[PDB]
Input
Amino acid sequence: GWVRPDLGDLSKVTKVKTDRPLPENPYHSRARPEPNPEVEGDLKPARHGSRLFFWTM
Amino acid sequence: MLKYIIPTIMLMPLTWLSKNNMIWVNSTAHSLLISFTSLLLMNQFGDNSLNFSLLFFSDSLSTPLLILTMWLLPLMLMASQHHLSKENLTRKKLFITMLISLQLFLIMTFTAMELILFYILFEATLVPTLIIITRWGNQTERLNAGLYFLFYTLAGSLPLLVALIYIQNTVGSLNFLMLQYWVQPVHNSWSNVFMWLACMMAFMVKMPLYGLHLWLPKAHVEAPIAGSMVLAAVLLKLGGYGMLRITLILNPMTDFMAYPFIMLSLWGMIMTSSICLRQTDLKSLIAYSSVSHMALVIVAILIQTPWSYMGATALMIAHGLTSSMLFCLANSNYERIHSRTMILARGLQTLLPLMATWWLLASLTNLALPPTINLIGELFVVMSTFSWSNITIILMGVNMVITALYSLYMLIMTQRGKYTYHINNISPSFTRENALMSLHILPLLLLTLNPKIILGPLY
Output
């Protein structure tokens, strides 16, 4: 009772039922470095301008 | 200070938009009005300086220098207009523009609060001054004189730029009001020895310090008359003014770092005074006289006492008017005989009686006759250096003897004796020349009636 699979069948992506638990850390990767402190706030004008030497603005 | 900066700038469109033949009339008249308004800076308090804004301030030190600066522009215009008569109009206007731009830089230099702003404007004065000497000087050597003037100054100023920027990083500011309160003592180390030198040597070359002075006689012999007047009256005082301010932040290291420069100045003043006795060129003699006088200023600034700072301020003002007058007197002879040799034309009192009186009055102030402000300043410096060390009275005393000798020798050689037989183009003094001389000496002698306004902040 064997039927030959048709053109295209054997290249299908199929789904599989497995009791094997889904791997948690397959790459065995360490903990990632913490991101730099994100900056959030209201952008105010620069205090007293450029402050470059003698400039007032 | 904008009430002086803007009208000074307006002298430029005034000159360029004037009728062709009214460039000298217009610029002279309006630069005198500016000079008149400069007396409003006399609103000086006993505790606080006059602090206009974040950028500019006046105190008792800068105010007399500012008034001298603004008074000198109209005088330089009268002095210059004769020898520039054959110049084409556009080049006359450019000459006046260089003088106006020099005044603009000078009044900003003397009033800047922040020391880098002082440095930039202090440096900006080089450009017009160099242009005036090299473009409108008379002889071949003016190109070399420009190079010596430029590179002497830059050899000193560039280390100053590094030191000032260093100071701001460490202290956080170069505002002079802040430095008065945040100043910290300079501790002994090789780093601070070179910081001290970088802070001072630029101003020493300007004074000029003895040993660094040889550029000055070259510049004067080569410069046109207006160049000499601004050079002698105000430009040398940038060094004095700079040292008076920057010594605030160099204590106590100045206590021993000053010694080599006091020895140079104390000995230098005797050597330059004696040199004046043997000079053959009249402009070169006056240039050496300036080195001798400025030697006292350096000593007074370095010993840092109230009396010496008052003496230094008074001498700077008195020397400015006197030396500028002497150059104008020498120039008026030059415009007749076209030679700076002192022995060429003699016995000129017989031919120009009134002009011989200007010579006499100028010489009397140069040798510091009491009660001229020339003596007041010199006397105050002599009093303070006596306390510094009693022995200095001998060096000061000898210099006063030699100073009288070359001051009168210059008067005797040119004005007395027998007139040179073959010189027969000694025309009578012009009203312009007499007015020019009297606009030096009259303000100078009027200041005797009220000296306090030239004694600086320590008064």
User: Anything to note?
Assistant: DSSP finds 19 helices and two strands in chain B. The CA atoms of residues 173 and 294 of chain B lie 31 Å apart.
